[PDB]
């Protein structure tokens with residue numbers, strides 16, 4: 871009914887950290903996760919429960935911070951850009967599905983503002 875949970879662990883992928891991946895987990899994710907607006911974004915959108923039966927028709931690639939958090943904890947990302955893309959996909963999804971001015975879009979905008987500020991201080995590759 872809902873799409874399967876996105877993959878958060880990669881078998882046979884070696885454990886490798888980078889400065890940027892460390893920053894994305896220990897600074898960026900940590901700051902966004904504790905924000906008062908984080909909660910709609912802490913797990914996949916359950917469009918069946920939330921009565922959004924057109925959501926998956928519009929959103930071909932769902933993404934959320936719970937998935938990102940698990941991916942970072944599991945060292946699923948090969949590089950920081952994959953993780954940054956997941957954050958960007960999450961925000962884009964919100965902006966192309968919901969009416970501007972709806973609470974959820976205002977919440978996404980506040981989280982993205984903080985995200986982009988932290989990304990301005992991303993360590994150089």
Ligand SMILES: CN1C[C@@H](Cn2c3c(c4ccccc42)C(=O)NCC3)CC1=O
Nearest residue numbers: 910911915920964967968972973974975
């Ligand atoms: C990440 N999500 C959550 C989904 C459910 N949803 C919506 C609002 C909303 C507000 C607070 C929690 C969930 C909310 C809102 O303002 N207008 C309608 C949609 C839509 C979406 O893209």
